[PDB]
Ligand binder design. Structure first.
Ligand SMILES: CC(C)C[C@H](NC(=O)[C@@H](O)CC(=O)O)C(=O)NCCCCNC(N)=[NH2+]
Length: 218
């Protein structure tokens, strides 16, 4: 099992995206994980449409800019028979009419895998063997908002009160011997480490990173 993983190096990760002032994190987390799995299956990286999920998945319990869940979105994608490319259904950060076009599909899924709750070990194995994984985290603290550099360790984090869906693309150990998760956020490149955060790993599921982790099946 690898000591470090960076799926960005292996072509499985799209550029940092920016959700702006729309509360759509779930849709970026969803597209992140499915971009990774479509890449692993197909050999092709294709950026996928967050606006398609926002616009079209309300009957799966997703409420667009008022929040949603990654598993509900993988299910919408299964039932719908695909999700459109970013290029043909670009992100608007508003609620709009469903404009899904099956001719512009960028990826399909057949379902998903939920990693057991709290299990950072099963999360590491999924990240190592499958690829980037959708995760829910407690991103509520000032320290997360202002995060710039190094390994994020917020003692005040909840492992159970989670508000922000993001993407684990890798993991490692920093030069102080501190284990971390390499996380892709959807707050654009000016946040954190060009849009990425290192979140402390094997510290009792800090910020709930393994509380609600899943990846789609293709
Ligand atoms: C971890 C994330 C994905 C939770 C989700 N949050 C959001 O979608 C956005 O508000 C957050 C954001 O930063 O854009 C949310 O609040 N969804 C509502 C779900 C309703 C309750 N069901 C649950 N949590 N099983």
């Amino acid at each position: 099992l690898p000591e470090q993983v960076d799926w960005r190096k292996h072509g499985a990760v799209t550029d940092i995206k920016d959700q702006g002032k729309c509360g759509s994190c779930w849709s970026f987390s969803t597209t992140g994980a499915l971009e990774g799995q479509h890449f692993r299956q197909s050999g092709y990286l294709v950026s996928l449409s967050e606006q398609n999920l926002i616009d079209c998945s309300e009957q799966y319990g997703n409420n667009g800019c008022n929040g949603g869940l990654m598993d509900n979105a993988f299910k919408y994608i299964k039932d719908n028979g695909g999700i459109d490319t970013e290029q043909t259904y670009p992100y608007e950060g508003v609620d709009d009419k469903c404009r899904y076009n099956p001719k512009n599909t960028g990826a399909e899924d057949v379902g998903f895998v939920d990693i057991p709750e709290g299990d950072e070990q099963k999360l590491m194995e999924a990240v190592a063997t499958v690829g980037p994984v959708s995760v829910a985290i407690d991103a509520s603290h000032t320290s997360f908002q202002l995060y710039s550099s190094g390994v994020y360790n917020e003692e005040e984090c909840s492992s159970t009160d989670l508000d922000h869906g993001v993407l684990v693309v890798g993991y490692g150990t920093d030069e102080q011997g501190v284990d971390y998760w390499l996380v892709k956020n959807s707050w654009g490149r000016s946040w954190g480490e060009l849009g990425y955060i290192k979140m402390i790993r094997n510290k009792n599921n800090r910020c709930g990173i393994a509380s609600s982790a899943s990846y789609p099946l293709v």
